[PDB]
Amino acid sequence: PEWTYPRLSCPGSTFQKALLISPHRFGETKGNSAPLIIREPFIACGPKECKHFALTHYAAQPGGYYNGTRGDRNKLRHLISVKLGKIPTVENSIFHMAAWSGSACHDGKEWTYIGVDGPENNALLKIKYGEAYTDTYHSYANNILRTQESACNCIGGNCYLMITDGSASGISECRFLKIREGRIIKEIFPTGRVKHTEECTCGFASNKTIECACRDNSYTAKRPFVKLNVETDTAEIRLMCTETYLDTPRPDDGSITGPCESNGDKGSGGIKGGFVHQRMASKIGRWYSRTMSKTKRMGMGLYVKYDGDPWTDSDALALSGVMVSMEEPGWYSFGFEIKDKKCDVPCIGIEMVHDGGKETWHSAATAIYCLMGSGQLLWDTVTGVDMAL
Amino acid sequence: PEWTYPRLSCPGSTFQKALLISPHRFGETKGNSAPLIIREPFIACGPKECKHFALTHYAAQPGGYYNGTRGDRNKLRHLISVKLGKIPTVENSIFHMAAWSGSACHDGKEWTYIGVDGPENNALLKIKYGEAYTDTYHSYANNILRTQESACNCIGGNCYLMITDGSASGISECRFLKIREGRIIKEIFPTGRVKHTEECTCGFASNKTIECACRDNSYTAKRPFVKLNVETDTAEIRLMCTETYLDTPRPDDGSITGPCESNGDKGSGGIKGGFVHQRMASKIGRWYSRTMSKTKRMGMGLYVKYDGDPWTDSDALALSGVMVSMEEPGWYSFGFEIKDKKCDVPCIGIEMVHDGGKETWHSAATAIYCLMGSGQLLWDTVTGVDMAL
Amino acid sequence: PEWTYPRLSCPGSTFQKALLISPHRFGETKGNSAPLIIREPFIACGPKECKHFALTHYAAQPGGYYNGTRGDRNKLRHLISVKLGKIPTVENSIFHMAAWSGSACHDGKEWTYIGVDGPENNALLKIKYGEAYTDTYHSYANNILRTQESACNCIGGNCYLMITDGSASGISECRFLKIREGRIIKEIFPTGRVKHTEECTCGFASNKTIECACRDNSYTAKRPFVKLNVETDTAEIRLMCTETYLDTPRPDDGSITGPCESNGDKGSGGIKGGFVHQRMASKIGRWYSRTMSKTKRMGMGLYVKYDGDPWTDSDALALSGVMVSMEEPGWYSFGFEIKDKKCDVPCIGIEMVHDGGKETWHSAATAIYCLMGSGQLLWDTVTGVDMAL
Amino acid sequence: PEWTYPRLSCPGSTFQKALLISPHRFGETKGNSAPLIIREPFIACGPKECKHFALTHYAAQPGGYYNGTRGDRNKLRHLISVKLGKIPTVENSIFHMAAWSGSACHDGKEWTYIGVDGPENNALLKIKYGEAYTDTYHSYANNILRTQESACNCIGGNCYLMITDGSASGISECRFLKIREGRIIKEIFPTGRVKHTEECTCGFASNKTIECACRDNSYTAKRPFVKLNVETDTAEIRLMCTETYLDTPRPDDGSITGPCESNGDKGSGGIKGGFVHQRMASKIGRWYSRTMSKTKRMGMGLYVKYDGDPWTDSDALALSGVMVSMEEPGWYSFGFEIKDKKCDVPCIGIEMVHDGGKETWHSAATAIYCLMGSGQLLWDTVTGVDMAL
């Protein structure tokens, strides 16, 4: 086998509903299954297989370890996976490493797995290549060293990963690691609007550029937007200019006054956002998702824009379809690409969290939408799960 | 590996009982298993593996999602599979795509998976090649776009698939899609008796011709019969002329007066029917199955006729044996072929539904009969399942 | 790959305890497993894998299908397997075909599976090669056509199988089938003491000869003994002359007066018996097993004799060790050979039935003994199962 | 494939927390899983896979066979394994052989499995290569013949294994077996301090030498230390001279007066200890672990020393980090190495026993620490398990 590279996307002009992974449809008291309790799911694909990753709390439904499953970080949390299409139960899953923050990617020869754990003030990112633990990176701002909760991206054997460190309420200046065969060979320090960047959802816009739509959890409801040049290994960050603000919470569309760079209102709090590239011969599409509600983690709409510069274009994003109605939960969302025989298929996945508060279990389903055929997006996704059962 | 083609059937002159997949033998309250709730099962084989497909309601027995499992279409419904011989439980199965109507087939190099979902008045057929979503086809009569519920058929890398759209009570004019490596490369519009055609059970009569025995759900208890020329890509449809009417409901054998084309009575309602080819050097056998009861979905008898033209032959089909007694359920039935080292083995499968009404669960066992050796068919199949447990 | 042949056995002069498969250690009300209800287990090995087969009643423990699990034949009974070392549960097992009498063997390229079902007066043997059903054999005495309940034996791609038909109380004259790539290419009619032969436990004494230790269920507690010449395809049967009578029930050792051919007393009833070959350069060992009790299916001792002719040798078999104490159940026993890199390892397996009558479940564990190292046999086997749980 | 040899360790200067296998997180009454009840876990890796071994009592939680799970040897005990990362449940595991003492190792081509069973006064070590049972070794002091409870060590196809036999309270003079493709080709009798040696944790210090840190269960809290020359096949044993005594129980560090060879106090009782090598170009690191408590099986600290001779160096071992706090259980510990593409990764594993006395179940989790990156060891491990559930 050989190193992989991004290719032209497969033909298409609309996303459709592809596949639901709702493990908790089998978690009843009256049933006989063991779906794992998770959050922060995401998908990453190699040349033959797509794997479905998540961060488990090392407990199952039904069970007696529900207390603490709404928490973010503890000493039991682990990165797990199954082959996409399999239900992530106790027996089906594989446990990769301890982690309360994760990522993964295939370089064409082998899987790289990324997981952060350790204490608040001095967390530690850990890298695993196939079966071997190979390297680490240390906390540099001593406040919850952190990573993407989605697929890293490899080209020509060089995989690029976003990390961040700092206060969830204040400054969190992100970096990028460049990783080869499980080992870190360069640190990349972005320039520009670097005040606060988290949980970048990243992909290839071409053989030369990686772009990421990220989260600012303090200052703005506009998404920070990264452009990484992989030939010179330099990165730059500015806010997205569109009036279709992609974060949650957010104010009404277009109501932030000033030029592209203004923050301005309802900027504290946030959500991880979906983002994927459609690469055509002489054109590029950018697909994004955002909650249906402006304040709450409910619903998910798909949006799209062809060409232009997301840093300077104030034009509204075209609303493509409703993937999750307002009456269903829409939490984190992410992008990934499936590898067809001669082309790549852009997809958006959506974490659909079963939230009933800290007094019962806390987990999530995963809905998948991909570019397929022509026309308009046709159907939405429900989890089907009743949390009383 | 290479493209596959239909070959000469293996030696034999009778079918026998081969294998039972009864997953609900393990769904007791007192047991510890998780068989999936399903309907519309079917089998499709490649050069090394046979896969057992079905449409699940994304629920398991025992469990608490029984409400709605008698319904036909919803947002949870999925195409799933196991390796034939494995019990399709939560953990054993793989989820391919969302769908409330399906099909699948191997072309010699890779699996093609077909699934239709979306709303009543604008459903959408979706195609997946290996792991990649690759193409779609749109509803053309805006009333439940629909497919075979059985194996498509691939020759020289070209796979052929029946679809239909229209009123289940009126006109539903079917088409055929020609699919290559996951993408549609021709639409085929049949000529002749096209008034109403559904759920074609299709196979190769030779390297030149695919034939299908289908369902008219409005007009007649004679099965519509398709002949598709795969060299010119043309298709023709006329009613089966035999006095052994294969649908359910149906009137007494031979009691429809007039020539081969007459409808005539008890034509509204219907069932998907089994049909498979036995290809010999200078002879062709056509095997078919039909319920034992004329009105009800009870029992299944196997029938056979050698040579002739099913469009013009009014001769009765030879009753070969009882596969399911009048006291066991006989719902959908289908054909498929297993690939031995140098020849193909024709088989008929039978969906045996556990029906207790809308107030409890609704699923199915699957019984398999295949051509093996000489003599007469010897034993019937029971599910063994008591629905109270 | 290539056709396999028997080779010289690996070095050793004693059997030891190898491995226990006790699936019912996990069938408590208070546990969360699904071991399959079975009887008639046996083991067969190819060049890379050993499979553990059994005849299931298509029910599990705990469950609500216990009624009928003491019965011998019904419509739900199936040949199943797992890779030796795995617990045969609902999910772990694979269902090969319907059968209430079975056998299997690998020819070096592929697995042949054998299963009989059908009605009492007209049962039917069925053959499957890999995934394909390929041939049948018909009942010839119209009274429970029947097979080995252990491994067939393949040489140079030709596999040899014992069958029988007739009254369990009267005449049952056995035959042998010669099978090649799933198809029957010769019937072999044995000569000599053919009055009554069942459930032969067969193996290679060399590239030229297969020998089998069988069961006479009517006339005698001496085991019938088959010598099949595989070059000329001829078979002969005489009673075993040893005073160490291998059947159950049996009279005291040596107490049957007359020459080698006398029946004489306590001959009605019987059991399947273990038997395997140890092939050395200029010597041959014959290993056998028999219950510890003379009347009852309790215990199992291992016995051995080097060279001679089992038809004419009245010398006592040397008692090698106790594999199952008198306080543990000892039902069917069988032989098989494991394939090490350059030599074959003889083994004896023992069905260890959990019998509590017709009012509760009925299944079995499987204990395995193999030739390994030097000295004497050291330890016995218990199932560990309490049937009340 | 080819024979494997030890290589240079991967780059790094500190261990970190890698992975937790806590199967009993899923053993609640309220849950639906079946983790196996085990003790004496260990890990061993080949060129593509790491397998997680243990000795089971052939019982699961929840279940009704808890009585006897605190015992050390019985007739049900078995060597089992899963792929490292999988939860060892009933279905996931594979049963290798009957054993109440074990070991295993890969030689580059195939897996060797070692298991001891049999009675107290005449136990028997059994060897299995891939699927075949191949050899045995007999008890030589007639008191619980015994082995490592950790990975054996293979070079150029020759695998080396420690065994012992004798009184747990008196003399137990260990030997080493040299094993090739499943068969013993040399016995090696160590010279020097041979009074009492058990459960050696062994690894390669180079292509020439194997070193083992072992357990004296009678005489001393200093660990006996073995040096095996694999070119001459000779072995020597002397006590570790360090003032950082690695056994439990043990007296205060440094308080055993006299030269390197003195016993002296609190020597009766003991524990199996972690030990692994870090092989660099011109330097060697020795990593070790020991309980946090001096008297009890609580906690586990990691210690390190570079170069010197452990037989004569009285210098204190450098304390590297706390792997398990004093409030968590710290039982057996062991070394292994994962194979990266071009270098080997040293790791320590820790058995973390759920002990609630003889009146309830007795089993263990497994925590894994590996050499990765630079800095200091950052986080500890908890099992998460409440034994009341």
Ligand SMILES: CCC(CC)[C@H](NC(C)=O)[C@@H]1[C@H](O)[C@@H](C(=O)O)C[C@H]1NC(=N)N
């Ligand atoms: C405090 C920093 C947060 C990111 C802005 C926080 N991430 C971590 C690593 O703790 C996320 C946030 O608190 C939760 C959310 O917003 O859903 C998930 C949570 N993410 C994870 N538990 N992996």
Ligand SMILES: CCC(CC)[C@H](NC(C)=O)[C@@H]1[C@H](O)[C@@H](C(=O)O)C[C@H]1NC(=N)N
């Ligand atoms: C309304 C059109 C019907 C076919 C004639 C209908 N098909 C769909 C796609 O809904 C079938 C029919 O109503 C049910 C049956 O007859 O068993 C099954 C049902 N089939 C499926 N649920 N796939």
Ligand SMILES: CCC(CC)[C@H](NC(C)=O)[C@@H]1[C@H](O)[C@@H](C(=O)O)C[C@H]1NC(=N)N
């Ligand atoms: C009546 C003929 C018997 C052989 C002598 C009988 N075999 C069959 C196929 O029914 C066996 C016998 O009755 C039972 C036993 O002896 O344990 C098992 C039983 N064997 C199986 N159920 N496969």
Ligand SMILES: CCC(CC)[C@H](NC(C)=O)[C@@H]1[C@H](O)[C@@H](C(=O)O)C[C@H]1NC(=N)N
């Ligand atoms: C009597 C000899 C002991 C070794 C010093 C004893 N070993 C055996 C093989 O029984 C160990 C010891 O008693 C128990 C322990 O210390 O944890 C485990 C126990 N080890 C195992 N059950 N494998």
Ligand SMILES: *[C@@H]1O[C@H](CO)[C@@H](O)[C@H](O)[C@H]1NC(C)=O
């Ligand atoms: C990127 O590079 C490789 C050649 O190195 C090429 O085959 C591929 O088509 C390129 N990708 C795109 C999107 O053009």
Ligand SMILES: *[C@@H]1O[C@H](CO)[C@@H](O)[C@H](O)[C@H]1NC(C)=O
């Ligand atoms: C169909 O075509 C191929 C050659 O292209 C041939 O090998 C095969 O035998 C043909 N099928 C039949 C049924 O004759």
Ligand SMILES: *[C@@H]1O[C@H](CO)[C@@H](O)[C@H](O)[C@H]1NC(C)=O
């Ligand atoms: C049987 O035949 C093959 C050669 O055809 C040979 O390799 C093998 O050693 C022979 N078996 C015995 C037991 O001698």
Ligand SMILES: *[C@@H]1O[C@H](CO)[C@@H](O)[C@H](O)[C@H]1NC(C)=O
């Ligand atoms: C040991 O031997 C092989 C060559 O036989 C070599 O490739 C390897 O590097 C050696 N190991 C060490 C630790 O130097």
Ligand SMILES: [Ca+2]
């Ligand atoms: Ca924000």
Ligand SMILES: [Ca+2]
């Ligand atoms: Ca009709």
Ligand SMILES: [Ca+2]
């Ligand atoms: Ca008898």
Ligand SMILES: [Ca+2]
């Ligand atoms: Ca000690």
Ligand SMILES: [Y+3]
């Ligand atoms: Y399972």
